[PDB]
Amino acid sequence: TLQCTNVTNAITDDMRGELKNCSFNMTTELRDKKQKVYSLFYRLDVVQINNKEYRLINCNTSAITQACPKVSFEPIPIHYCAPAGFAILKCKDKKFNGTGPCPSVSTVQCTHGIKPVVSTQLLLNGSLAEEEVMIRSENITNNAKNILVQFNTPVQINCTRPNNNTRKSIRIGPGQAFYATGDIIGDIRQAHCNVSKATWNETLGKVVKQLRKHFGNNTIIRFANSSGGDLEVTTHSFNCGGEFFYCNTSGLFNSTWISNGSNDSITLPCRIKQIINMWQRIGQAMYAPPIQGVIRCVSNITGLILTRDGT
């Protein structure tokens, strides 16, 4: 059981509560002795018991492991290679569309360097299309299928957590430490991501002019935000600096396109979590340790995972 106040934030309601200052009793190096300790926690790491009493999000479902502080999450490139007596064939046709006869081919030992970047809604740092913003799906005429689009040129996203958190170590057992967030230096400001409006507007124009091949010239076509579901899928959920971000994309996908300044970049607010699950799993949670200082990372958006309703 945790006793939690808000951090001293006095802004708009519920946003005051977006991070909590929780204190609790914890085991020491010695079996017979407890210690009273405190940590900051983000609102999404905790749930209320019923009063100011809280527990971690996972305790009624999963055991939890601290991710070791030394192992990096950086997506280092992997090449996949075939055993002797097998070969990889590479399609060379620039206007290949994911199925059927590729009329131009070469053979290799291994793939190019693939980065295991994990991100929902938008595809980050992955390979550009050879020419045109190519669109792929297994059956476009069915609305239930996802539709990948792959840009011929990157549109650049800058993400940040501008709070300067401190790391703190608590021993919880003989030779075992828990990394809490100690406090925050200076001003509190929201974690967010920016993308340039002209380049995003133009790039969305190019995706429409390719959907106009598969859907015809008469149709006005529209973009909308995701309708509902888990936080993992209703948001551009992704990793930056080793923090996990959950940006509200409703500023990107909000336009309707006719059958026919600018420096103001749009900005997406992002919530953050420390307690997480690999999205294809339940029953084993992970706690991501807190990162010192300000976080920034710069990345290329190079494709999208769209869906269609059924203009």
Epitope: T8, A10, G186, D187, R189, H192
Partner: antibody
Framework: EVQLAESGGGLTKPGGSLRLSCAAS????????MDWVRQTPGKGLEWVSR????????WYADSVRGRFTVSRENAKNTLYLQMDSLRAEDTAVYYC??????????????????WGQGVVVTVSS | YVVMTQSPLSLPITPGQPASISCRSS???????????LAWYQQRPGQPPRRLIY???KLDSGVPDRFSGSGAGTDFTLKISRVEAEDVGVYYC?????????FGQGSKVEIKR
């Protein structure tokens, strides 16, 4: 248009306490740092204390550290200086002023603008 | 602490004439974000200090364009291209880069007669 106004200045004997109020108008007061600055007819302008926007962080001049505490009530758009252990040297006019903005994604530079109307404070037996 | 001082202490000036006020610090006022948080205030008789100039050279809202400000490192100047009757008062340079914030001893303007 932005305005600040102050109340609660007056006379006291030494060793006593006074509380000043400054009230904010024409802006979202919880987006700004705030300062107290005093004028003595001799030495002129002297910085006294600063507070950040959520009130977690506070700073003081050496002449007042621990004798004074600054505090704020964002729900009331209002700032207080609680002065204790006053001396004849604390005789001054006290002005409040507005400092660093903290907009939702971004923090600005430091400022003293605008300044209040000012309150007279006098310390003698 | 960072000391501030202005070189002319009093300026008897004729209405319509230019006037200028040097200000100097004990240490460089360029801050770790790349700005220089010097500013100039004036105080007419019986009134609170009013800011005129900030970040060395930017003007406050509604300040008359006859005011100007310039400088670098430790050495700075106000200049007024012509004084008016509403320019009669006391002028202070000050700095916000380093705590405690600090002010010059200030310079008087008076009507030369």
């Amino acid at each position: 248009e932005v305005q600040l106004a102050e109340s609660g200045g007056g006379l006291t004997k030494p060793g006593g306490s006074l509380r000043l109020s400054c009230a904010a108008s024409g802006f979202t007061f919880s987006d700004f740092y705030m300062d107290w600055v005093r004028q003595t007819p001799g030495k002129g302008l002297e910085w006294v204390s600063r507070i950040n926007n959520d009130g977690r962080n506070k700073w003081y001049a050496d002449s007042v550290r621990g004798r004074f505490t600054v505090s704020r009530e964002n729900a009331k758009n209002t700032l207080y200086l609680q002065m204790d252990s006053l001396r004849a040297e604390d005789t001054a006019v006290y002005y409040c002023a507005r400092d660093r903005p903290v907009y939702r994604y971004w923090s600005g530079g430091y400022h003293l603008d605008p300044w209040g109307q000012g309150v007279v404070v006098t310390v003698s037996s | 602490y960072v000391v501030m001082t202005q070189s002319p202490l009093s300026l008897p000036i004729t209405p319509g004439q230019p006037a200028s006020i040097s200000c100097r610090s004990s240490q460089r006022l360029l801050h770790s974000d790349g700005n220089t948080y010097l500013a100039w205030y004036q105080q007419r008789p019986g009134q609170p200090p009013r800011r005129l100039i900030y970040e060395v050279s930017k003007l406050d809202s509604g300040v008359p364009d006859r005011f100007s400000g310039s400088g670098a490192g430790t050495d700075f100047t106000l200049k007024i291209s012509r004084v008016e009757a509403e320019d009669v008062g006391v002028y202070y340079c000050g700095q916000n880069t380093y705590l405690p914030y600090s002010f010059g001893q200030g310079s008087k303007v008076e009507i030369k007669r």
